[PDB]
Design a protein around this ligand. Structure first.
Ligand SMILES: Cc1noc(C)c1-c1cc(-c2c(C)noc2C)c2cccnc2c1
Ligand SMILES: Cc1noc(C)c1-c1cc(-c2c(C)noc2C)c2cccnc2c1
Length: 114
């Protein structure tokens, strides 16, 4: 499916998040071997990242805007659940999610499939 809403999520929301200076740790899946986190996949059952979301948007994977929004949500939530309250990554996530919500507050309201 291809809608006004999904185009907004791609051209406005993803565009803003992807180039952000705090975005780099979220542009690809968490690599638990590289980062030395043997329990990552024990704790986080549904990994998600902006590279995956971007690919899905580019390939018309999503059928509704809410679906894409849930993937953004999962990505941020995984981060808050896995990491320590004091970890810098949490601050970076909060910053990006603030922008996510600000942009989503202005997304087109009715899913005009095109
Ligand atoms: C301008 C213009 N004049 O004719 C058309 C067609 C567009 C257009 C429409 C959408 C569009 C579509 C398709 N659905 O909602 C919107 C907005 C776009 C989306 C992203 C980028 N460029 C877009 C350009
Ligand atoms: C996202 C995410 N969710 O859980 C963790 C853990 C991350 C993370 C954290 C760091 C990170 C940063 C930034 N500083 O310390 C660590 C660890 C990264 C660094 C490079 C690449 N990917 C990284 C991914």
């Amino acid at each position: 499916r291809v809608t006004n809403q999904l185009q907004y999520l791609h051209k406005v929301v993803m565009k803003a998040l992807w180039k952000h200076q705090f975005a780099w740790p979220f542009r690809q899946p968490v690599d638990a071997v590289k980062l030395g986190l043997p329990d990552y996949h024990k704790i986080i059952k549904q990994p998600m990242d902006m590279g995956t979301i971007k690919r899905r948007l580019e390939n018309n994977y999503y059928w509704a805007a809410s679906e894409c929004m849930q993937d953004f949500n999962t990505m941020f939530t995984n981060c808050y659940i896995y990491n320590k309250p004091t970890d810098d990554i949490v601050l970076m996530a909060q910053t990006l999610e603030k922008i996510f919500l600000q942009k989503v507050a202005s997304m087109p309201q009715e899913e005009q499939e095109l």
